[PDB]
Ligand binder design. Structure first.
Ligand SMILES: [Mg+2]
Ligand SMILES: [Mg+2]
Ligand SMILES: [Mg+2]
Ligand SMILES: [Mg+2]
Ligand SMILES: [Mg+2]
Ligand SMILES: [Mg+2]
Ligand SMILES: [Mg+2]
Ligand SMILES: [Mg+2]
Ligand SMILES: [Mg+2]
Ligand SMILES: [Mg+2]
Ligand SMILES: [Mg+2]
Ligand SMILES: [Mg+2]
Ligand SMILES: [Mg+2]
Ligand SMILES: [Mg+2]
Ligand SMILES: [Mg+2]
Ligand SMILES: [Mg+2]
Ligand SMILES: [Mg+2]
Ligand SMILES: [Mg+2]
Ligand SMILES: [Mg+2]
Ligand SMILES: [Mg+2]
Ligand SMILES: [Mg+2]
Ligand SMILES: [Mg+2]
Ligand SMILES: [Mg+2]
Ligand SMILES: [Mg+2]
Ligand SMILES: [Mg+2]
Ligand SMILES: [Mg+2]
Ligand SMILES: [Mg+2]
Ligand SMILES: [Mg+2]
Ligand SMILES: [Mg+2]
Ligand SMILES: [Mg+2]
Ligand SMILES: [Mg+2]
Ligand SMILES: [Mg+2]
Ligand SMILES: [Mg+2]
Ligand SMILES: [Mg+2]
Ligand SMILES: [Mg+2]
Ligand SMILES: [Mg+2]
Ligand SMILES: [Mg+2]
Ligand SMILES: [Mg+2]
Ligand SMILES: [Mg+2]
Ligand SMILES: [Mg+2]
Ligand SMILES: [Mg+2]
Ligand SMILES: [Mg+2]
Ligand SMILES: [Mg+2]
Ligand SMILES: [Mg+2]
Ligand SMILES: [Mg+2]
Ligand SMILES: [Mg+2]
Ligand SMILES: [Mg+2]
Ligand SMILES: [Mg+2]
Ligand SMILES: [Mg+2]
Ligand SMILES: [Mg+2]
Ligand SMILES: [Mg+2]
Ligand SMILES: [Mg+2]
Ligand SMILES: [Mg+2]
Ligand SMILES: [Mg+2]
Ligand SMILES: [Mg+2]
Lengths: 126, 18, 46, 110, 102, 56
RNA sequence: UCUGUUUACCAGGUCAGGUCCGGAAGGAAGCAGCCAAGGCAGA
RNA sequence: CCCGGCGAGGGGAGUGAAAAAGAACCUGAAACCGUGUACGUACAAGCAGUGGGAGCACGCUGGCGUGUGACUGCGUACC
RNA sequence: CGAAGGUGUGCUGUGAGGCAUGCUGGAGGUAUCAGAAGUGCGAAUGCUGACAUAAGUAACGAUAAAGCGGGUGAAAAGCCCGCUCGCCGGAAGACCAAGGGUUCCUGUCCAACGUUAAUCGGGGCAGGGUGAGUCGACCCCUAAGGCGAGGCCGAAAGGCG
């Protein structure tokens, strides 16, 4: 299936090619609903991302749900960073694992057609 | 291609708005 | 078994429907009492 | 040093959960985890989750060692009960209590 | 007929910030004002990736009652009280102690 | 047929004396996997009396 | 005692990546991978 | 930040004079239901108390308070 | 420098009571002498609310019936997929009117609802879906019957036509 080794590969392949002005322009469908400026700083987020993924042992990378409080302490200590960044990175891998399972079960055109952008009420951003 | 662009788009992109 | 209320819209309306109340003196008095008691709906319509 | 955990509003009677919660009163938390594991009950599961939780609390919040712990206080109170209605023969309706319960576990090293 | 208005320099009469001085940022219809550097609250925010806000404890200025602030007369160096008079055809504000126009 | 007077909490306690569970005392530790488990039941890993009898 | 393989952080060494100090020179704590090493085995 | 199911529920941190003010939110009584501690109870018959009364526990400074109440006299709720 | 209330304890009166103080509580109380009462609760098969009891008992709604492998998943007797098995078959199938009103389909969610569990649903939230010259209504026409210009009838309203 999908692992943080496969996310390691997706990430050292994506930190090579990627930019935030070539990625926020290839879509004008979610550059109208979300602010055109909310992309990221790609170099920093993918260098932190590759740092945090590299700090992992091979059994924590191949199986991402065995990572708990002590392991996040240690991933924060080896890459010299915050337990909160490690947290929200295990959370983005959680969502993209969710989405590659939803591309796996349903066809590429049914999981690209039923994808939804939302407003809590129809007024802009509110 | 098809799964390269559907990976890459929803990945960088849905990394962004959530 | 066969219970009392067997619904039919037509019957419902020709009987207690608004115009059927606008038929008679006592219809119009029921409507008065109803507005005076500040009823949400006077008759059954829709 | 005491460390607490509470599950509040668990669906179970107080009375059904007590039956389980009594097996582990006083034990060394290891042994407790096991007794709960091979106990066949729903309350078994509730109580166990609360217990493990309390141990996590002790260790992360208070830095207390898991091997030293005992279960010093454990008790179950009667939470807010949601009323319902079960309809009966001859049209007499009968109000139902779906009971909740408050499971409190308190562990300490000493 | 608003005694305290935007951009005035006020002094805080009451509360933790009593004695302090500052410039009025805006007023709310509740008879409340928001003063600069005054009445600072530490507010926790849950990070919004839609608004590109991080989370955290961020210090913001809280609404304070307008009964609790006085127009500051820098002339007398004290808290003052406003009154309205008619100069030209225009209603204007003046101080009650030395009786001169704001 | 229904009770004439309210049975007291004392009574109600007495009746429930016997409804106490019995703890499971014996935890068998396997030779190979060193897992605890009920006697005569296979482990979580499908180990029994030294063997892996179930790959599961 | 050779070889087969196992053991996240909280025994050791190398410590990539990344991160701290410095304008720069360079250091530094150290996660992973590897080797000790500790489990379990072929002899 | 930590357990948990990307829960419910919790425990930390922080805000605040106060979080036994946490949105199931002021005060939080009684019935009711528990956990801990003291004494009592498995040869004993009844409106369960009252008169007496050992022993034990706990407070005091060898005496007094409090809790309990083995045993015995009398004793068939209120309206 | 801690009111009302709440809750212990101590003292005091012949009683209904009073006084003092520990904790709780966090802003109101009120002497004295008068005045006026929605002025005192255990009963009324009293009223409303709350919580006991029987009891963790009776019951889980047709005796058509299940079993196994695999999937997902925190967890699978119930979900999905496969192989069997069993039931209806003038219905327990298919298509409408009546009535309902979104229950339809897709994602998504598991607190409450489902007499159990639930990853499932006619449950929750979001989106999507209903295409007519010839189908039906609307319309053309009358039945029973209704309403009824004038008109007759009637204290009044109204009755008949
Ligand atoms: Mg009908
Ligand atoms: Mg009925
Ligand atoms: Mg009788
Ligand atoms: Mg029993
Ligand atoms: Mg929470
Ligand atoms: Mg503070
Ligand atoms: Mg307080
Ligand atoms: Mg409550
Ligand atoms: Mg207040
Ligand atoms: Mg309260
Ligand atoms: Mg209370
Ligand atoms: Mg109470
Ligand atoms: Mg004898
Ligand atoms: Mg005896
Ligand atoms: Mg007897
Ligand atoms: Mg006596
Ligand atoms: Mg003593
Ligand atoms: Mg004494
Ligand atoms: Mg006696
Ligand atoms: Mg006698
Ligand atoms: Mg007082
Ligand atoms: Mg009063
Ligand atoms: Mg008081
Ligand atoms: Mg006090
Ligand atoms: Mg008081
Ligand atoms: Mg207080
Ligand atoms: Mg007075
Ligand atoms: Mg008074
Ligand atoms: Mg008087
Ligand atoms: Mg009265
Ligand atoms: Mg009486
Ligand atoms: Mg009765
Ligand atoms: Mg109420
Ligand atoms: Mg019961
Ligand atoms: Mg029985
Ligand atoms: Mg029986
Ligand atoms: Mg029956
Ligand atoms: Mg039965
Ligand atoms: Mg059934
Ligand atoms: Mg199966
Ligand atoms: Mg569940
Ligand atoms: Mg299965
Ligand atoms: Mg079945
Ligand atoms: Mg099947
Ligand atoms: Mg047949
Ligand atoms: Mg219809
Ligand atoms: Mg609906
Ligand atoms: Mg459906
Ligand atoms: Mg259920
Ligand atoms: Mg669905
Ligand atoms: Mg639905
Ligand atoms: Mg036709
Ligand atoms: Mg006709
Ligand atoms: Mg006429
Ligand atoms: Mg007529």
């Amino acid at each position: 299936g999908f692992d943080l080794n496969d996310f390691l590969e997706q990430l050292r392949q994506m930190k090579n090619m990627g930019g935030x002005x070539x990625x926020x322009x290839x879509x004008x469908x979610x550059x109208x609903x979300x602010x055109x400026x909310x992309x990221x700083x790609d170099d920093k987020v993918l260098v932190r991302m590759e740092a945090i993924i590299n700090s992992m042992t091979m059994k924590e990378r191949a199986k991402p749900e065995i990572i708990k409080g002590s392991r996040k302490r240690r991933i924060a200590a080896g890459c010299g960073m915050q337990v909160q960044d490690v947290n929200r990175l295990l959370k983005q891998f959680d969502d993209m694992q969710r989405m590659m399972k939803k591309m796996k079960k349903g066809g590429x055109x049914x999981x690209x057609x039923x994808x939804x952008x939302x407003x809590x009420x129809x007024x802009x951003x509110x | 291609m098809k799964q390269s662009t559907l990976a890459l788009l929803l990945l960088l992109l849905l990394l962004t708005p959530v | 078994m066969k219970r009392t209320f067997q619904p039919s819209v037509l019957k419902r309306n020709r009987s207690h429907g608004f115009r059927a109340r606008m038929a008679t003196k006592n219809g119009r008095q029921v409507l008065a009492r109803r507005r005076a008691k500040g009823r949400a709906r006077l008759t059954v319509s829709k | 040093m005491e460390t607490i955990a509470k599950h509040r509003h668990a669906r179970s009677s107080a009375q059904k959960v007590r039956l389980v919660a009594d097996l582990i009163r006083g034990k060394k938390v290891s042994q407790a985890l096991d007794i709960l594991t091979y106990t066949n009950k729903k309350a078994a599961v509730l109580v166990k989750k609360v217990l493990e939780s309390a141990i996590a609390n002790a260790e992360h919040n208070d830095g207390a060692d898991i091997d030293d712990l005992k279960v010093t206080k454990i008790f179950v109170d009667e939470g807010p009960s949601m009323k319902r209605i079960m309809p009966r023969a001859k049209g007499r309706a009968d109000r139902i209590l779906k009971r909740t319960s408050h499971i409190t576990v308190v562990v300490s090293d000493r | 007929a608003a005694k305290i208005r935007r951009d005035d320099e006020v002094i805080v009469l009451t509360g933790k910030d009593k004695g302090k001085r500052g410039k009025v940022k805006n007023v709310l219809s509740s008879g409340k004002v928001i003063v600069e550097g005054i009445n600072l609250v530490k507010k926790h925010q849950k990070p919004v990736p839609a608004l590109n806000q991080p989370g955290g404890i961020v210090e913001k200025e809280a609404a304070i009652q307008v009964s609790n602030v006085a127009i500051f007369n820098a002339a007398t160096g004290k808290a003052d009280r406003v009154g309205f008079r008619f100069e030209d055809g225009k209603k204007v504000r003046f101080f009650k102690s030395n009786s001169e126009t704001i | 047929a229904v009770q004439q007077n309210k049975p007291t909490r004392s009574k109600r306690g007495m009746r429930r004396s016997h409804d106490a569970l019995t703890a499971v005392t014996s935890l068998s530790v396997d030779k190979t996997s060193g897992e605890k488990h009920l006697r005569h039941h296979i482990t979580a890993d499908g180990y029994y009396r030294g063997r892996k009898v179930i790959a599961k």
